[PDB]
Structures are given as structure tokens and as C-alpha cells.
Enzyme design. Structure first.
Site, PDB file in Angstrom:
ATOM      1  N   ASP B 290      52.292  58.900  28.048  1.00 42.20           N
ATOM      2  CA  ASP B 290      52.216  58.993  26.448  1.00 42.20           C
ATOM      3  C   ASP B 290      52.973  59.746  25.253  1.00 42.20           C
ATOM      4  OD1 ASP B 290      50.681  55.264  27.424  1.00 42.20           O
ATOM      5  OD2 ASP B 290      52.445  54.874  26.556  1.00 42.20           O
ATOM      6  N   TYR B 374      51.819  48.492  25.105  1.00 43.05           N
ATOM      7  CA  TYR B 374      50.631  48.910  24.275  1.00 43.05           C
ATOM      8  C   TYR B 374      50.687  49.639  22.830  1.00 43.05           C
TER       9      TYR B 374
END
Ligand SMILES: [Co+2]
Ligand SMILES: [Co+2]
Lengths: 620, 620
Positions: B290, B374
Site C-alpha cells: 500500500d 481497505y
């Protein structure tokens, strides 16, 4: 009307009457412990029978007695004489806290030691410390207290700043004889004061802290009925209070739509020990079972509004008995309130364009107790998502010694000449489980790493394994932080919509357990502390991990004994006992007063619900 | 002004202008990464030199370039063309995300796969995911994204409830070609919706939650100066923001009396990886960095008052570059506020009669980001007692798959036919230590158990041992929860009043580290995640544990290569890299939207101060 209501002043007066009348209460008798008994799982008996258990001490020297009375019928149900050498001594009486200093003040050996150090006896405080069980054969059967001295320069002076090392005394508090005075050598008595309210030490107080107002314009979201029954965001429970354990939680359940589903039948901190790691004979016997030997509930503080509990607080003032059976109220001894807990759930979805955010909250039930130099806050938290958590906050003043010249492998220096012996604070949470009822089992879950090869060609796969603990002889477990070890409590006869036994997962902090050599007395007396998790078959007389009479008990009582029964725990009425604690090597920052250090554990729903139980919380 | 101030819109436009002027930013060029560089070590240089580093992508397929410019001097410090097959591809561009679904919509292999499942292509969303490095030789040197499909029934539908298993496509986003379409077989597409705002799923919303109002009548206790310089309860620091790392803390210092004492020069989350543990070829390549591949900062949400940040909040709106070098502000992207934190220290002394209680507080600096399904919140906390803590909060929607008919060892069931593959969320905190300055060292501290016998006759003694990590070669450490292992960072040339080197102790949560087989691609690409702690000698080009270019980059850069230098770290300018994460086996309670799960670490003063630093805290 609830059989789980808190003891009333009247019930305690009634116990006193009943005892007096039966001749169980007299001039030389002292109530060392008194507490209401929990119902015996069989409400079909109807009506109501409130029983109280009492430990009665005899100041003359006669044998103490364990008595159970029925306040509903005004009868004595049982009264047994105790052989303390066999079953252990009774809890230390608060009125014995003064006795050790008084008896020593006229002892020539003690006075000799103080004189050699040029210490004024009227300035020497003596701490009434538990004795434990060591090589002193003449102590068996006798109620002994040990004393360590600390100099108090003036009334408002902090004596802990001035430990008198190299000296220790043993006192028989019944015969009132100083059985021994040990003086291993003179150690300089640390001179600096530790008076944290003395502006010469604090310096100018900060004027930078602006106010933070926490208010509830419409009142709290929880309701208290029947004196101690709480209803909050689907949770339902009864807040009890026992002089030994402190705040106890009963009937923790969650209203999942139509059903009030039980989760934990009874939650409590059943023991709390503080073992010391200083091999000096002056302190090598030191192990304080704050719960078992001193009774933490009796020393609970009255919590001031704003200072101890901020926001919209609802208080409970539990009533306990004094040494003579008279009821004593602990005003504002328990705090109940709900607090914001940040973000509960949040997702900004690109595809749907929906941005969703919800806030979390926790119901808090706490009390703060003082045991000599330590002060501990016990906090129970209930969260919106079904998580249950316990947190212990340790503060107070560190127990001091002299810091040896040449340093030490077992003591740290806090100030010039001042030492702080290494120690631990180990707790035992007793969780009488009721996951959707009493038919429960526990499984140990470890993460499972997999080897790259056939079926896992990229070597990315990882799984998990669950081992059911079927008998008590296999229910003594240790932590394994490395494999993410946890323990799941489930009901094999209650399945969620995906047809999986509903359950709750216990997440431990994986702190070190008891460090003492396995052959030491403390290892035998606090064997519960040597392992992280124990599972036993419920039994109404198996209440504490260390047994009923911890004071000077020889060892092996409680858990090792209960476990020895090897009862079936696979789908039965079971109890989980979780050992968790702090290992302390005090720092300079811990002196003059300790900032809060914390430890705990929590349980999260694991397939208990059919989906998230918090979809109905409003945006607000 | 301060060389640590946040990048302004003007500086970003100026970098664009400087690049354009230099012939480095023509029409086919795109900014994949733009960030301000920290001032060089030792500000002996006269005045300010605000430097910006840029990663420039070329949409026509020409080689990308890494460029550093001096916005102050209007110059290009360096510009190098990159060989991506060797050093790694540039971070994924936000614009390349939509490309995957678009290209696939007209690919006949894809259409055939959808037709076989009776799915309307106009309703099939494709999640554009990083590709990693596997056995596809034709991918070396190309910018590839892999796609996984999810059905969206209507515009506001949550597509995650409807994964399309057995299908995956690989797309070259520059040449715009679908390189591969793999269909392993049809799987039922889960039918239940996961619409958490649908009253049919939520049920009637609770009306039981009463308001909790948190206010500061006189405003906050912290001061914000020079845009991002914060001063609060003796703490001093600068809050920076980088598109890749997100919130970065600079110059964390504590004013001890007259002196401002450095503690941490720079603190950031330098990388975060989300590895999946399902060995199905449809997902076995799945690993999201990420931070390194997507750049978590560019996806920071604008935080809503009352919802995201409750209380008296002071916001920062960081400015970043868009794909063309134009400045873009993230309105209210960072929240700054202080929160009450219970009891700081408490003691009711019997001997002195003094009852003392002080409340705690913490400064909070946070931001929340969204990467596909997410959402992660990054929180940094500063406490009154000198404690520094980081907490990651993971929420959002679970990444789904089909739940295999005969169960799964690597996937759990969330709803009928709906699965959730096992995965982890592992972070890397990069702590450029400055404990009372730059001369620092690290010691690994383990609790030491002692055997009963000579010198420890009662078997109660326990100690601790500290091992200094002297060279990078011996500075790769693992957790040992069982022996209470921690790591202490000290300045061997700065001693407290008791003549001991000042220090700070790092307390890790000891969660499992990377589970993947050591021979996997992810173990090599996320090598930092296999160990809990690494210590390196500071170097201005050693910024991330995974290197500058993570996207489709094999092992060869990052921590394992830095460590090979085997530099002296015993009393030198050092950096601590701490790996910590969550191992997830999704539960039914995680569906349709996940409640927050947390992980983190903290550092507590260890002989840094000469006594408790909070003695000057008033009543409260
Ligand atoms: Co302690
Ligand atoms: Co997850």
C-alpha cells in the site's frame, strides 16, 4: 429482587446478629472475610436464599472458623473449625497493620539496630508484610507478619524515600512476640525526599493545560435497575462487589435481536500476586498476594468526581463488613460510564460512491484500590461490537531498598543510594464461561505456516489449527506469540447460520509469566502464575487459583489441585483462568511516584453472530 | 521559514515549471511520485535549499526518470533515466486504475469467461491490483496490473459481496493490451448483498445512543506555529506529509527544564504490505504494498468533524501534485487534537495521609486513507510522561472470494458461498533515532531467569541482560515475547544524574511476522517483514525497507542490501526499522463491513529523565 443484587447494610447487620447469637461472635473474634454467595445454578428452587460466607479469626489464639449463614432464614448453615497449619491462615486483618511497628518499638534487638543507624524509633515506619512459607518450622500454625522499615522524617513525609536496608523482623501477631530480628549489615538510608507535592521537587506547576469537558447533555445511554443491573447497547449484566476480588461481573449477555444470549457467567480477578526478584534475605521472602492475602476490595478508594472519573458518571457505593460485623459503605467506590472510542467502522467506496463512517463506544466499570505502596485501577470494558476487555492500571510508589555499592543484578537505582528491587504484578482472571449457555469447550488456535511445494507452488499459503482441550490434564496452556496463539471458547451445540459453533476468542498480551525458579516456594504457592491459561470443570468450591486461605499456605493449593481431578471439559460447564502480568525493572521515571503502567486481555466474538452486530448503529 | 514546513501549492507549481523548463515534463510525461526532501545532515550550509524528488513516467513508453530539483534555486540537481526491469517500476498511477476494466470490457477471452457465468459485462467491476513478480517473463520491463472481478448489481451496490472466482486477467497498462486471461472454472457468484446502509440488512437503527459531547471551552493546549510546528505539554515537533508515507513526524523533542532534548529525528510508516495466503492461482500472486506501490498519502480522506475527529480539532490540509505537476490539496486530511487519557499517577498514602491523583492526556496526530476495499487510519500519540506511540486502525470491506464447496484451509466463510482469503497487514516503522542527539546505540534487553542455588537459595531471583548491537550484521532481530524482549535506544555519551546513559525502550506487540515460505517471491520482496527489528547506519538514500521502486521489483534493494554494508551502529547516527502487523482469518463479524482492528508499538523513557517528568502536572 435479583439474587445478584449487591449486599445491603441490613444483610450484613443480620449476619452479625446470627453469628453473635450462635456464639460465633464475641470479644476475641474478628471477621477476616465476609461476602455474599452466588446462586448455585438451579433457579427452580424459587423464593430466595441469600447466604454469606465468613472467615472468623480469634485474637486469643483459638482456632478460626469458616461459617456460612443464611440471611433469608436467619440461620447458621455451617461452622467449621480450621486447622490453619493444614489449610492456611486467614486473610491479614487491617487492624494488624499497626501491630508490627508497635511490637517492634519495644524490642531491644530492633532498638539496637535502629540505634546503630542513628534512627529515631518514633520516626521509623514498619510495613506489615505477608510472611509466606519458608524454612522457619516454628511458624507453621502461627500467624506471622514480617516488617521492613522506612524512615518518615515528618508526618507528611514519604517514608518510601527512606528504606532501612540490611534489617528485617518477624512478628507473631497473636502471641505478640517478635520471633526474630535479622540485621545483615548497615546500609546508608537514602537521604533525598520523595515528596511529590513539595514545590521544591515539583517546581512551578504547569499552567499550559486547558480544560477538556466531557459531557452528556441527555444523560448516559446505559440504565441501572435493581441497584446493580446494567443494560447498555445490547449488553446486559450485573455488577457485583466482593471484599476479596473487588468488582465482579455477573451474567454478561448480549441481546442478539430476539434472544438475550449469554457469553460469560462470572468474570473476576481471582488473584493478584507481586513476587520480588531480590535474592537478599532481607527481601527474598517477599510475595504479596494483594487479592488473596490482603483482600483488594476492602481497600477500594472513594472515587472523586472529575479527578478519578471524568464525564457523566454513575456510582455504586458497595457495603462491606468491618472486623466486628458492622456494615461499612465504600462511598463512590465503583465508576460506571460510557466513553467514546474513536472509529468503529469506515469505508469510502469508489464503485458505490457511498462513504460510511461509524464511531465506537465502550461501557466502563471500574474501581481503584490501595495496598500499602501500590494503587491499582481495575477496568472492565464492553464494546459495541461485542468485545469484552479487562485492563489493570498499576501506579503508586515503588517499594524501595538501598541500592548496593557496586550495583546489582536484581535492583535498579532510582535516586542516590535508593534502589527498587525487581518484581512482577501477575493477575488471574477467572472467567466462568457461558457461550450461548453452559455447554462449552476451549480450543487452542495456532497460525500454521506452510511449505512451498505441491499445492502451494508460490509458497504464499498459511493456515491455522485448532486443538480441543478435552480433559483438565491437557488444559494447562502456555503462550506462543510467534504462532499467534489464542484460545477460542465455543458452544458445540449452538451454531451460527453458516453452521459453525458460535464462539469467542481470547487475545492475551503474551507478557512473561512467573520468573521464579520452578522449585521455589512462590512457584508452588502461585503455580497459576507459571502458565498463561488453565481450563477447569466448574465447581462451586473452586473459586481462587491459589485456594481459599492463601496466607502462609505451604503450596499446591488452588489450580494445580483442581486440575489434578482431570475432569471432562469437552462440551461442559467450564471456567477459563487467564494469567497475565507486568514484569518491572523500575526506572528513574518511576520515582518519586509511578506513572500508570497497564496490562490486560480481551475476548472478541468469533462466529458468535451471523454478521456484524453493529449495522444498526446510527450515523449520528 | 523552517525547512520542515509542509510543501505549499506554490512550490509544487514551481517544481512543475522547473521540470518543464528543463525539458523533463513534456505532454507524454506524468508525475508518479513527487515529494519534498528533508534538509541535509548538519545545517552548516547557509540558508534554505528546498529540494523535491520526482519520479516521472512516460505514457508513450519511453524510460521513466528519477529527478531531484532545487525549488529554491530553480535548478535540476540530478535527473537519471531508469531501467525498470532492473530497478523496479514506478508507483501505480491513479489514472491506470480504470484502464484494466476498460480494456477487459472488449477482450473476447474475458467476455467469454463472463458469458460462461451469465454475467453482464457492464456490471462487472474489476479491481486493478499490483502484479508483483512471478514466472511471467514477458512482464519484465512492462507495467502490468492484474484484475479480479466483482459484480455490482446496481450503482450503489457493494460489489465485494459478489466476487467472481476462477477468473483473473493481466493487463499491460501502457501499451494497453490484455496479456493473459485465466479461467480455472466457474464458481457460484455469492448472491447476498453486503449493503450496510440498506435498512433491510441494518434493521431499524438504534435510538439508544445518547450524545457524548467533548469540548475545550478555552481551546486546545497545543500551539500550531509555522503551519505545522506543534508545541504541547513540553513536546516539540513538526508534522510533515509525504504522498508515499503519509504523515511523517520530524524533530520529536521534549523540553526538560531549560533544554529541548531530541528523542526522534524522523518517524514514519516507511512501508506496509498486505500478503494473501490463499494458494489458488486466482489469488496466489496477491500482495499489496500500500505504501510503496500505491502511495497511501495520495488516497488520504478528507476528515469530517464530529464523525472522524470528535472534539476540538485543528486540521492541516496537505498539498500534493496531481499526475501533471499541478498542486492538489487534501482538505482536512490531518487531524490534530489532545485527548483525556485516564489516570496518570495515583497514590493514597497511609503514613503521610496524602492522597494524590493526576490525570493523563495524549496529543493525537492522525489521517485515514482508502486503498480499494481497505481503509487504514494512522495515529501517532504523545503522552505527558514522555511515551511515544503509533497505532494503525484497519477497517473497510473484506477482500472476498468464493467459499469452496468442501471448505478451505486458507479461506473462511462470511456468508453463503462467500469466502475471505487469509492475509496479513504488516507495517514498517522507520525511526531515525536522536536520543539526546545522534550518537546512539541499540541494546536488546531480555528478562533473565535464575536457578535456585548458591546466591539464590530461595529461587526467587530474576534479572535482565542487555546486548549492544554493534554492526549492522548483528542488528536483525526477532521478538521473544516469552523473555519479555524489548530494545533500548540510548546515547552512550549522555548520562542521567545517576550516571547512566539516557535511553528509550521500544515495546513491540510481538504479533506474528511474515508467514510466507522463505523461498517465495513475497518473502524476498517484503524481506523486512520477516524480522521484527532492523538497525541501520543512517544514509540519505536509505528511505524505505523495500527500496525506492517496489512495483514489480524483485529482491535486491531495501534493508537486506543496506545491512550488507555492515556499518558501525554502536554510538552512531542510526535508524530503527520495526516490523509489526495483523494476521487475519476473517470472521462472520467482519461482514458486510469490518469493525476496526488495531496494531502498533510504543517507546517509553528508560533513564532518560532524572526523575518523573510529570511532577509539575496540576490538579485536573
Ligand atoms: Co511495579
Ligand atoms: Co484484514
Amino acid at each position: 429482587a435479583s439474587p445478584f443484587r449487591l449486599a445491603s447494610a441490613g444483610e450484613i447487620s443480620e449476619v452479625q446478629g446470627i453469628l453473635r447469637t450462635a456464639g460465633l461472635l464475641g470479644p476475641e473474634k474478628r471477621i477476616a472475610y465476609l461476602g455474599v454467595l452466588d446462586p448455585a445454578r438451579g433457579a427452580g428452587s424459587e423464593a430466595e436464599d441469600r447466604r454469606f460466607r465468613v472467615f472468623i479469626h480469634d485474637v486469643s489464639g483459638a482456632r478460626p472458623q469458616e461459617v456460612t449463614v443464611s440471611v433469608t432464614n436467619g440461620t447458621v448453615i455451617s461452622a467449621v473449625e480450621l486447622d490453619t497449619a493444614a489449610t492456611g491462615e486467614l486473610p491479614v486483618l487491617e487492624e494488624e497493620f499497626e501491630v508490627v511497628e508497635q511490637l517492634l518499638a519495644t524490642d531491644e534487638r530492633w532498638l539496637k539496630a535502629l540505634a546503630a543507624r542513628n534512627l529515631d524509633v518514633s520516626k521509623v515506619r514498619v510495613a506489615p508484610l505477608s510472611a509466606g512459607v519458608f524454612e522457619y518450622a516454628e511458624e507453621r500454625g502461627r500467624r506471622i507478619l514480617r516488617g521492613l522499615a522506612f524512615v518518615q522524617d515528618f508526618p507528611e513525609d514519604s517514608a518510601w524515600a527512606h528504606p532501612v536496608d540490611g534489617l528485617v523482623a518477624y512478628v507473631d501477631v497473636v502471641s505478640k512476640e517478635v520471633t526474630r530480628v535479622i540485621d545483615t549489615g548497615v546500609f546508608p538510608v537514602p537521604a533525598e525526599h520523595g515528596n511529590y507535592t513539595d514545590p521544591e521537587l515539583t517546581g512551578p506547576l504547569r499552567t499550559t493545560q486547558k480544560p477538556i469537558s466531557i459531557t452528556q447533555p441527555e444523560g448516559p445511554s446505559f440504565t441501572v435497575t435493581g441497584g446493580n443491573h446494567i443494560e447498555w447497547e445490547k449488553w446486559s449484566l450485573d455488577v457485583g462487589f466482593d471484599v476479596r476480588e473487588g468488582v465482579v461481573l455477573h451474567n454478561i449477555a448480549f441481546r442478539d435481536g430476539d434472544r438475550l444470549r449469554p457469553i460469560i457467567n462470572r468474570a473476576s480477578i481471582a488473584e493478584m500476586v507481586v513476587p520480588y526478584g531480590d535474592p537478599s534475605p532481607i527481601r527474598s521472602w517477599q510475595n504479596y498476594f494483594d487479592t488473596g492475602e490482603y483482600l483488594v476490595g476492602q481497600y477500594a478508594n472513594s472515587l472523586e468526581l472529575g479527578c478519578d472519573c471524568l464525564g457523566d458518571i454513575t456510582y455504586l457505593s458497595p457495603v462491606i463488613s468491618d472486623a466486628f460485623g458492622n456494615p461499612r459503605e465504600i462511598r463512590n467506590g465503583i465508576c460506571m460510564h460510557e466513553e467514546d472510542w474513536g472509529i468503529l467502522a469506515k469505508h469510502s467506496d469508489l464503485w458505490s460512491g457511498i462513504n460510511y463512517t461509524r464511531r465506537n463506544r465502550r461501557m466502563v466499570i471500574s474501581f481503584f484500590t490501595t495496598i500499602g505502596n501500590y494503587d491499582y485501577g481495575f477496568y472492565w470494558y464492553l464494546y459495541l461490537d461485542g468485545t469484552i476487555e479487562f485492563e489493570a492500571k498499576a501506579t503508586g510508589v515503588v517499594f524501595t531498598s538501598a541500592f548496593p555499592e557496586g550495583g546489582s543484578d536484581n535492583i535498579s537505582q532510582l535516586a542516590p543510594g535508593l534502589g527498587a528491587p525487581f518484581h512482577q504484578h501477575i493477575f488471574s482472571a477467572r472467567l466462568d464461561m457461558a457461550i450461548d449457555g453452559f455447554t462449552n469447550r476451549v480450543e487452542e488456535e495456532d497460525v500454521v505456516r506452510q511449505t512451498m511445494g505441491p499445492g502451494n507452488e508460490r509458497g504464499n499459503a498459511f493456515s491455522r489449527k485448532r486443538t480441543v482441550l478435552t480433559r483438565e490434564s491437557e488444559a494447562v496452556r502456555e503462550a506462543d506469540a510467534r504462532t499467534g496463539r489464542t484460545w477460542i471458547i465455543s458452544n458445540p451445540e449452538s451454531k451460527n447460520r453458516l453452521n459453525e459453533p458460535v464462539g469467542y476468542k481470547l487475545h492475551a498480551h503474551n507478557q512473561p509469566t512467573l520468573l521464579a525458579d520452578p522449585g521455589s516456594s512462590i512457584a508452588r504457592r502461585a503455580a497459576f502464575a507459571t502458565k498463561d491459561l488453565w481450563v477447569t470443570r466448574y465447581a462451586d468450591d473452586e473459586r481462587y487459583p491459589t485456594g481459599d486461605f492463601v496466607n502462609q499456605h505451604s503450596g499446591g493449593a488452588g489450580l494445580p489441585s483442581y486440575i489434578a481431578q482431570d475432569r471432562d471439559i469437552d462440551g461442559q460447564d467450564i471456567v477459563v483462568w487467564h494469567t497475565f502480568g507486568l514484569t518491572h525493572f523500575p526506572r528513574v521515571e518511576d520515582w518519586p511516584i509511578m506513572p500508570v503502567d497497564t496490562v490486560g486481555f480481551k475476548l472478541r466474538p468469533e462466529g458468535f453472530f451471523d454478521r456484524s452486530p453493529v449495522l444498526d448503529v446510527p450515523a449520528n
